[PDB]
Amino acid sequence: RCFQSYFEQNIDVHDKNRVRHICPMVDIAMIQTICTILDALLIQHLPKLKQMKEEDEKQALEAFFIFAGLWAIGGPVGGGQDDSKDMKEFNTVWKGAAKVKFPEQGLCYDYYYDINENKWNTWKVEDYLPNDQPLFSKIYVATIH
Amino acid sequence: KGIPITEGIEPLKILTTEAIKSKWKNEGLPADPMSLENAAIITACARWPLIIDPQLQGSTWIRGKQGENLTTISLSQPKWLGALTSSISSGRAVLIEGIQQEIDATLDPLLQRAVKKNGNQLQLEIGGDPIDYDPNFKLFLMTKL
Amino acid sequence: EVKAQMNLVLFQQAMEHVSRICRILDMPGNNALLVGVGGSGKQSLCRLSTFINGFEIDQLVVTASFTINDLRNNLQEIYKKIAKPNSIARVFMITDSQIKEEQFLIPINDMLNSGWIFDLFPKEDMDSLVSGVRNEAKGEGVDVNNLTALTSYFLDKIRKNLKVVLCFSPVGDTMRIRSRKFPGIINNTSIDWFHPWPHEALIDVAFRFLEEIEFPTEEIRQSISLNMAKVHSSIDTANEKF
Ligand SMILES: Nc1ncnc2c1ncn2[C@@H]1O[C@H](COP(=O)(O)OP(=O)(O)O)[C@@H](O)[C@H]1O
Numbered sequence: 001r002c003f004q005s006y007f008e009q010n011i012d013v014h015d016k017n018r019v020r021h022i023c024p025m026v027d028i029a030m031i032q033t034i035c036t037i038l039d040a041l042l043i044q045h046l047p048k049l050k051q052m053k054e055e056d057e058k059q060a061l062e063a064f065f066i067f068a069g070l071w072a073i074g075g076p077v078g079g080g081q082d083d084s085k086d087m088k089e090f091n092t093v094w095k096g097a098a099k100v101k102f103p104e105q106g107l108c109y110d111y112y113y114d115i116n117e118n119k120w121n122t123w124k125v126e127d128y129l130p131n132d133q134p135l136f137s138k139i140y141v142a143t144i145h
Numbered sequence: 146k147g148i149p150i151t152e153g154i155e156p157l158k159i160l161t162t163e164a165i166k167s168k169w170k171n172e173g174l175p176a177d178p179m180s181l182e183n184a185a186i187i188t189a190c191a192r193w194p195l196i197i198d199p200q201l202q203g204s205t206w207i208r209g210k211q212g213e214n215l216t217t218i219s220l221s222q223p224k225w226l227g228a229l230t231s232s233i234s235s236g237r238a239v240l241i242e243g244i245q246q247e248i249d250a251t252l253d254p255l256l257q258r259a260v261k262k263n264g265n266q267l268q269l270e271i272g273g274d275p276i277d278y279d280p281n282f283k284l285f286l287m288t289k290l
Numbered sequence: 291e292v293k294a295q296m297n298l299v300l301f302q303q304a305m306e307h308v309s310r311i312c313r314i315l316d317m318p319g320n321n322a323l324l325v326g327v328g329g330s331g332k333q334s335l336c337r338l339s340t341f342i343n344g345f346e347i348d349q350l351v352v353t354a355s356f357t358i359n360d361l362r363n364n365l366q367e368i369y370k371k372i373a374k375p376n377s378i379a380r381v382f383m384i385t386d387s388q389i390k391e392e393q394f395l396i397p398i399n400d401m402l403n404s405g406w407i408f409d410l411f412p413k414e415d416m417d418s419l420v421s422g423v424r425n426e427a428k429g430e431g432v433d434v435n436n437l438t439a440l441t442s443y444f445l446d447k448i449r450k451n452l453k454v455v456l457c458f459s460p461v462g463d464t465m466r467i468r469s470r471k472f473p474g475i476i477n478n479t480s481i482d483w484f485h486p487w488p489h490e491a492l493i494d495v496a497f498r499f500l501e502e503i504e505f506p507t508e509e510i511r512q513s514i515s516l517n518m519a520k521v522h523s524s525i526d527t528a529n530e531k532f
């Protein structure tokens with residue numbers, strides 16, 4: 001129902017104007033990525049989905065799809081004068097993801113669905129630790145992105 | 146600046162005397178000052194002179210001046226490397242036809258005015274094997290463009 | 291005193307260029323790229339800049355007839371000197387003349403990008419270099435007989451002790467085609483552009499060459515040195531008009 005409902009009904013997803021891709025991704029290619037993202041998300045939370053009730057499971061499976069869908073079309077989004085402008089346009093159209101909603105003053109990317117919490121908790125980054133590595137390219141700082 | 150100098154200076158007189166202008170006139174050169182200036186430069190040149198001659202006006206003068214042991218070798222000729230090497234050793238003068246642009250890497254060490262002196266003899270490195278360099282060697286590069 | 295004698299003007303702008311090359315060599319892993327017109331002194335400024343710091347400069351010698359395998363053997367020899375633990379960091383000098391064909395550049399960019407060109411030596415030869423670095427790793431206090439972090443540490447050392455200096459001229463679209471063709475060169479190395487010598491610098495050049503020549507009151511010298519700068523500048527203004 002979710003696959004069928006998000007591609008057919010949304011003209012905005014397939015609209016060249018609304019979503020600006022870096023490379024001209026084919027429809028089939030974006031579906032293949034959703035599936036492979038959804039796969040890994042089910043294996044990790046398979047035991048939790050059985051313990052949960054069918055009502056909160058039905059929300060959780062939709063959420064998993066949105067997150068997976070977001071990222072499967074998220075990556076391709078970029079290019080132009082400003083990347084930020086193309087993201088904000090894509091953020092807006094995808095923000096209407098049926099019954100499930102995203103918290104305000106955050107990008108759809110920055111939020112991931114937590115099964116236990118069910119609150120779409122933003123990505124937590126580890127505060128950088130100083131290292132005695134001589135090369136600067138070796139030194140790796142973590143970012144939200 | 147007020148540097149000690151003669152009241153009436155002209156470049157033609159300094160570069161060459163009046164008598165040698167009268168010699169050149171006989172060797173297919175016009176009496177216009179621009180051509181005398183040009184003829185006066187190549188005489189005083191500390192570098193190898195690359196000449197641009199549409200209507201082959203320069204080439205006719207060069208052939209007149211170098212009456213004896215003048216050899217004209219185009220870039221297209223297959224034994225031009227072998228001819229130049231044998232010419233450098235014992236050649237009064239050398240003339241290179243064509244060489245319009247993109248000058249061959251084999252000429253680059255020759256084009257350089259710096260030469261290596263091994264005891265009494267002077268050695269210039271062109272191609273795989275170094276060739277013995279003799280004094281009073283002249284090299285003229287004519288290009289029709 | 292020790293190396294081959296090099297004469298240079300050592301004007302303010304040339305000295306600034308020595309300073310900011312010495313700076314790029316002081317940074318570990320980072321490579322220097324010098325871009326300028328033919329005769330800008332950059333090759334001679336690099337050799338000087340290298341010597342100022344505690345580094346040993348090695349330039350390849352190109353014969354008229356040269357082969358890709360001959361280049362690899364010259365590079366291979368340099369990597370044996372870097373591999374030893376108690377080694378001064380080897381600088382590598384390259385010019386447009388030294389690059390006789392575009393095939394000779396391919397190995398150099400894979401070196402300068404990261405570590406050392408893939409399959410430069412055999413696997414058995416690499417193992418013998420790794421064992422020599424293992425003695426150093428014990429002193430450093432890095433994990434030994436891991437055969438993953440050690441091999442990695444070897445690549446870090448090789449990167450730190452190899453510096454790659456490139457010299458091109460931005461006169462044709464050939465250098466631009468090098469940039470397009472070779473991705474590693476422009477992004478990995480630190481570009482340095484040589485502008486033409488200022489009017490004030492040109493005066494000092496003339497003032498240096500006029501020294502040890504007889505003159506009536508040596509006021510002529512000081513004036514000629516100005517006129518030498520004025521004539522060269524007035525050609526560039528006429529060349530812009532032309
Ligand atoms: N500042 C300077 N003072 C004196 N001679 C110089 C100076 N700069 C360059 N030269 C001379 O001109 C040559 C220029 O060649 P090089 O240093 O390789 O530079 P490039 O790579 O720009 O040709 C030097 O080798 C040296 O003989």
Ligand SMILES: [Mg+2]
Nearest residue numbers: 328329333385
């Ligand atoms: Mg040079």
